């Protein structure tokens, strides 16, 4: 219940698998259903249990297993008597983990933590408000995993659920299970943003890019700020907060000017640093979460009531709900504009702010609308679908799945019409008369367009070249020199910015203002800008030419002692006394090395007149001339948004395509082999001999309710004991379990439930943190996150390995630690933890080797299309249980100004069916890396790359394996300077062909040609 | 097994006696829940014969006719002039799809002879004249859906849709 929902999230002690069937008998011994006692014991100082009907069906309608292991066995721990605590994979069924002798212990070890909350939770002045819930929803995981305690699975029978995920799904479903008693209009709210990439690409200078990706995440965050305290937390369903660098930041700020104590935040800020942030540059020292990690593809679960202060209205207001979200989004944009106006007034006298102070009064009617439209649906549920006149109704497992299907079909029905947010504006009155506010050159031909947005009429015009100083004074901008400095510094001459891109440049010159909408009815619209004025937190942001020069930066750093002599006549070995804090970890790991890393390499050694200088300085100091190329990697997951619906497309990408869910009966022979195998492996212990009985009873010879009418196999033997079950009706063991499995293997998907979604959510969050730490382990720079994808720049040399290390990490298989995510072979394993990974869902990367001076709009849009179309056009041979079939997704595409090469990543269609599958994920990239080592270190001549043109048609034209083996072998040996090296293609790659039809891009067909294309791309990128 | 019937919705009084069974089972395809009518089926390629309004089999895809779907076999004096068929619930042009079907459904359609003597210069007609929309509310939505006047308090909402959702073509000969 509201402000009592903690018993929901806490109904079980996370040592639940340790007290079932007496696995720990002393826990219920020195204490003042069996496991529920310590559950009732640990729910103390706040309330007892809410088992009358608050948590009952919520636990029943979140677990999605009451229907799997039978409704009575689900509530009889002493059946199948599992003393062995196996942890199972949620997506897989074979990946396991053993849990032993690591659990809280009774009345002397159970108190080592329960009061440590009360070292930091109680002391603050609070009338038992929901800030406790907002300070339990996340740091419960933290006080657990910091107490070196292993996350136990949910049910000793079917352990495809971590206790934390179980209780979080409980709490999630509790909203619906409560609200549908009074008004019976619980909701499943889905918020979505339109044209993310289309918006991000509208910028320049990489500052507009970063803040655009930050806007798309904040403006959506601000929506839930008005929803994470309005009806509290635990509501935002799919974008989880269990590991969320925005929930954290908001909290640590919410514990300021609301419940501010000092030692408490000392206790937790360091604690939250380790298990959610890991970055030495915390939320503080930037005063902003450095990574935009909100996807946009967010969904929420709703009671259907509203509190106006100590009093909630159990009133329907059926559809007067989503317009509230829309007006909140608009109000967030209004707040950001108001904050920009205030900061321009506080900066009344400064060039770059003498303009925004001017434009934010030149036009305000236009800016009243957001620069990004959202797309909102809302599906409804009524008590007639949860209960049958008082009690848990049949098919109640089916509804949530059916509701999510309804919501996704509402969305896919709205994708069919795209509404660019620019369409919202009103311009017929201005663009027909002399009504456009132009600063600088007022174009005599009506107006011009923005050089960043491209479409909207710009309001500012800086001259191209007369002398580039006077004309700023002539045309009412500069009027002096103290401000034309900032003018020429923040917006290059010859630029034309619409209002929205002008706002983008403003924010990219002042990131802190995002707090204005990053907190959300938590401060004053002026408090934040006042805190900003009272500081001078300068932020540096990498450019394209900046990231194109990591290696030369580090060579100047390693040659720091013999270079500044030849330097210092151009002010490069200088030291900037200010404390600039970039969001680029590689900068934070440097810039205290007597090197002004805060410079514009475009100016000095990427110029046209000064590079002839520096190359000389380089020609005698043994440093390579810098590389005018960076890489632009962008990932995305296959069918993740359709994995949330349970379809088998992520398990078999290409084999079971999307469209095959209309008449999936055509593809019946495989969907069985997937689901029935999953199930017979789903659930360890002795139940394995049970689900196996009925698995094919559906149509072998038994019709409906017919394996249930014949098979007494084992259930009668799991009964007839002491006092266990007092209801002799044993048909209920299979009377409805047969229908459960019949639905599963008749509809071809997993029965979606809130637990499924929250598990995959936390998994996506952990994968985020991992990939963030991975980009930062390399010298890259993150531009986005969101589980579905990841956008980031990084130098051209550290791409392949990164990709090779990215996917393997995304599939939960790594070699090194990740700060504290000590990765495993299918689990993430924070210190004595084991959370399930995403081992079966694939991943697809897009890379663009782009010269630094290229039009960021175009390079980003190309990185987007080269992954969207490429994701749906490429096919290749994949071994479907030995025999080969054709796959679709899970590739890596490279682009070097046209020169393209698609590299597959799995070549084994059910991505993982064995612990040894992980070794062969992205192995082709390991092949390329080995070959690059042998070529650079001079064991294989470079000419091997070009000498392939002659072996191309031969290897392509040979349908025999060993013959191509000898062919590639002598092609390697001929250009093999050492002449007895053992670099050998993995002998399976012979024959993997790639067909790319219905598009005019030029792609090689054979894997061995794509490998050499990738090598040529990477090499030519470093020159 | 499970069967249903299509019934045209014209503006002419060929509507009174065409149905025989009101519930059949416990449910009908055409649902009306708190938002107006759902699952309205359209028959494309065929036109009507409004005087005893019946389905004239044309080949023009421009010709469409709409009607609602309910359970039953019509009046038990028919089926030598009607369309009885069975389609697995995926090959029916149903507008305002709300729920799902079990991928099997037996349908009945009021069918006509082409009257192979004249040139079918057809023409579509719209639902106006709320007076007709009023006295058609009873004949089709009462003897068939008893839930009306109990759950549909928004008759005025389910009135406009008649004048904007349902339409068809006619021979006019």
């Amino acid at each position: 219940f509201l402000d009592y929902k903690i018993i929901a999230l806490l109904h079980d002690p996370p040592n639940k698998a340790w007290v079932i069937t007496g696995r720990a008998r002393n826990l219920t011994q020195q204490l003042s259903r069996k496991h529920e006692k310590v559950a009732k014991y640990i729910i103390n100082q706040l309330f007892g249990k809410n088992y009358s009907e608050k948590v009952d069906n919520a636990d029943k309608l979140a677990s999605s297993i009451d229907r799997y292991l039978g409704s009575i066995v689900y509530k009889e721990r002493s059946l199948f008597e599992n003393r062995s605590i196996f942890l199972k994979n949620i997506l897989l069924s074979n990946i396991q983990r053993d849990i032993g002798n690591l659990f809280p212990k009774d009345k002397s070890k159970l108190d080592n933590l329960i009061l440590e909350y009360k070292k930091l939770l109680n002391v603050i002045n609070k009338t038992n408000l929901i800030l406790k819930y907002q300070l339990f929803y996340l740091i419960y995981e933290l006080v657990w995993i910091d107490s070196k305690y292993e996350n136990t699975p949910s049910d000793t029978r079917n352990p495809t659920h971590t206790i934390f995920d179980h209780l979080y799904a409980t709490a999630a479903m509790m909203n619906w299970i409560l609200s549908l008693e009074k008004e019976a209009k619980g909701y499943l709210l889905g918020i979505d943003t339109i044209g993310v990439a289309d918006f991000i690409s509208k910028g320049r200078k990489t500052r507009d890019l970063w803040i655009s990706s930050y806007l798309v995440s904040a403006l959506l965050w601000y929506v839930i700020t008005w929803f994470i305290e309005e009806y509290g937390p635990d509501v935002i369903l799919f974008p989880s907060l269990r590991f969320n660098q925005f929930y954290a930041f908001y909290l640590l700020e919410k514990l300021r000017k609301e419940g501010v104590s000092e030692d408490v935040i000392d206790e937790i800020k360091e604690l939250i640093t380790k298990y959610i942030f890991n970055g030495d540059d915390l939320f503080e020292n930037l005063k902003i979460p450095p990574y935009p990690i909100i996807p946009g593809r967010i969904t929420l679960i709703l009671p259907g009531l509203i509190r106006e202060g100590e009093e909630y209205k159990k009133v329907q207001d059926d559809n007067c709900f989503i317009s509230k979200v829309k007006e909140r989004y608009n109000e967030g944009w209004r707040k950001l504009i108001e904050g920009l106006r205030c900061y321009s007034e506080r900066k009344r006298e400064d060039g770059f702010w003498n303009l925004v102070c001017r434009v934010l009064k030149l036009t305000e009617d236009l800016l009243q609308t957001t620069p990004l439209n959202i797309r909102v649906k809302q599906v409804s549920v009524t008590e007639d679908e949860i209960f049958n006149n008082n009690k848990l109704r049949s098919d109640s497992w089916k509804i949530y799945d059916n509701k999510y299907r309804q919501l996704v079909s509402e969305f896919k029905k709205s994708k069919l019409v795209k509404v660019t947010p620019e369409s919202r504006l009103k311009l017929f009155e201005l663009t027909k008369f002399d009504k456009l506010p132009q600063i600088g050159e007022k174009s005599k031909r009506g107006y011009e367009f923005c050089t960043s947005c491209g479409v909207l009429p710009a309001v500012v015009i800086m001259p191209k070249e007369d002398e580039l100083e006077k004309k700023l004074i002539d045309l009412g901008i500069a009027r002096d020199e103290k401000d034309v400095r900032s003018i020429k510094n923040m917006i290059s001459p010859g630029e034309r910015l619409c209002p929205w891109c002008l706002v983008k440049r403003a924010l990219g010159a002042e990131p802190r203002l995002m707090r204005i909408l990053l907190l959300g009815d938590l401060y004053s619209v002026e408090k934040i800008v006042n805190e900003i004025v009272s500081r001078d937190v300068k932020i540096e942001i990498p450019s394209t030419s900046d990231i194109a020069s990591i290696k030369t930066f580090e060579e100047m750093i390693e040659k720091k002692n013999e270079i500044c002599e030849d330097l210092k006549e151009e002010e490069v070995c200088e030291k900037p006394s200010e404390s600039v804090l970039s969001m680029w970890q590689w900068f934070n790991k440097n810039y205290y090395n007597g090197i002004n890393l805060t410079i514009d390499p475009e100016e000095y050694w990427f110029s046209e007149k000064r590079r002839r200088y520096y190359f000389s300085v380089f020609r005698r100091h043994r440093i390579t001339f810098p590389s005018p190329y960076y890489a632009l990697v962008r990932a995305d997951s296959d069918y993740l948004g359709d994995l949330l619906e349970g379809k088998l497309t992520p398990y078999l990408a290409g084999i079971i395509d999307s469209g095959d869910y209309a008449n999936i009966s055509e593809k019946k022979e495989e969907v069985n082999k997937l689901l029935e195998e999953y199930l017979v492996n789903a659930g360890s212990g002795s139940i394995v001999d049970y689900v196996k009985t009925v698995l094919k009873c559906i149509r072998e010879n038994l019709n409906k309710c017919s394996c249930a009418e014949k098979i007494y196999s084992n259930e009668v033997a799991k009964v007839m004991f002491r006092v266990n079950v007092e209801k002799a009706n044993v048909e209920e063991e299979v009377k409805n379990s047969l229908e459960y499995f019949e639905t599963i293997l008749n509809e071809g998907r997993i029965i979606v439930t809130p637990a499924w979604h929250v598990s995959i959510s936390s998994a996506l969050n952990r994968g985020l943190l991992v990939e963030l730490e991975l980009v930062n382990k390399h010298k890259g720079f993150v531009i986005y996150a969101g589980g579905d994808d990841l956008l980031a720049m990084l130098p051209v040399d550290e791409v392949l390995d990164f990709i090779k290390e990215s996917r393997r990490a995304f599939a939960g298989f790594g070699t090194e630690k990740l700060g504290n995510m000590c990765l495993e072979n299918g689990f993430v394993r924070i210190n004595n933890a084991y959370y399930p990974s995403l081992p079966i869902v694939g991943r697809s990367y897009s890379v663009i080797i782009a010269h630094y001076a290229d039009p960021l709009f175009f390079v980003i849009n190309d990185s987007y299309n080269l992954l969207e179309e490429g994701k749906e056009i490429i096919r290749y041979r994949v071994m479907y249980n030995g025999e080969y079939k054709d796959a679709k997704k899970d590739v890596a595409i490279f682009r070097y100004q046209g020169l393209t090469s698609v590299i597959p990543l799995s070549l084994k269609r059910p991505i993982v069916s064995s612990v040894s599958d992980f070794n062969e994920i992205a192995s082709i990239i390991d092949v390329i890396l080995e070959l690059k080592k042998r070529i650079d270190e001079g064991r294989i001549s470079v000419s091997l790359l070009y000498d392939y043109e002659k072996y191309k048609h031969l290897i392509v034209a040979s349908d025999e394996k060993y013959l191509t083996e000898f062919l590639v072998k002598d092609w390697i040996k001929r250009n093999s300077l050492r002449k007895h090296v053992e670099f050998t293609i993995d002998e399976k790659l012979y024959g993997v062909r790639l067909t790319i039809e219905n598009y005019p891009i030029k792609i090689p067909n054979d894997l061995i040609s794509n490998i050499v294309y990738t090598l040529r791309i990477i090499y030519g990128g470093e020159k | 097994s499970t069967q249903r019937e299509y019934v045209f919705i014209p503006i002419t009084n060929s509507i009174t006696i065409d149905v025989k069974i009101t519930i059949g089972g416990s449910d009908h395809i055409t649902n009306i829940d708190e938002r107006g009518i759902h699952n309205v089926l359209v028959i494309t390629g065929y036109a009507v014969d409004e005087k005893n309004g019946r389905l004239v089999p044309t080949l023009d895809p421009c010709d469409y006719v709409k009607g609602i779907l309910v359970a039953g076999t019509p009046q038990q004096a028919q089926s030598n002039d009607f369309l009885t068929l069975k389609l697995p619930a995926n090959k029916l042009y149903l507008i305002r799809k709300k729920g799902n079907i079990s991928d099997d459904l037996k349908i009945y359609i009021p069918y006509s002879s082409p009257d192979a003597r004249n040139s079918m210069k057809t023409k579509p007609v719209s639902i106006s004249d709320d007076t007709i929309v009023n006295n058609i509310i009873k004949e089709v939505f009462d003897k068939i859906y008893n839930i009306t006047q109990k759950e549909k308090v928004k008759i005025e909402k389910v009135k406009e849709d008649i004048k904007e959702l349902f339409s068809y073509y006619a021979l006019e000969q």
């Binding site: 002659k950 072996y951 002598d970 | -």
Partner: protein, 154 residues
């Protein structure tokens, strides 16, 4: 266009590979495959072909072995390495001429039997020397690659 020839050459090489038994004959065939392709395009097709047949020793028994090799698969053209390899390369050229219809197959299989028509074969080839210099280059270079790859150097 000659992009099917990378398969034709594969077939012909598979034949002449399973045809030579003594490995020395295989290495000698590799030598011929490297040597003759330059001469064909330096000195002309007719001179090189005269050289090939002169070194091939067209006797009816080895001729029968070749005739079967055209159709059979276990065929064993035997003799001496430096003399069976030239016949193998002549077979390469003839397999090409047959399978690309440049010369009619029955006429070839017949003139490889009756000594009198064996001379009219050479005459025909003289009347098709320009045509068989343009078509066959890709095929012979593919054979060269295959020889250097699959037959270990001596």
């Amino acid at each position: 266009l000659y992009e099917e020839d990378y398969k034709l050459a594969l077939e012909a090489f598979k034949k002449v590979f399973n045809a030579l038994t003594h490995y020395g004959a295989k290495q000698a065939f590799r030598s011929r495959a490297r040597d003759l392709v330059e001469e064909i395009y330096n000195s002309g097709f007719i001179p090189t072909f005269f050289y090939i047949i002169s070194k091939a020793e067209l006797n009816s028994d080895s001729l029968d072995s070749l005739i079967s090799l055209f159709s059979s698969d276990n065929a064993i053209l035997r003799g001496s390495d430096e003399n069976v390899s030239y016949s193998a390369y002549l077979f390469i050229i003839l397999y090409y001429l047959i399978k690309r219809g440049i010369i009619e197959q029955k006429f070839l299989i017949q003139a490889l039997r009756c000594e009198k028509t064996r001379l009219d074969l050479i005459d025909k080839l003289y009347n098709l020397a320009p045509i068989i210099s343009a078509k066959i280059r890709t095929y012979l270079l593919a054979i060269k690659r295959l020889s250097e790859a699959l037959i270990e150097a001596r």
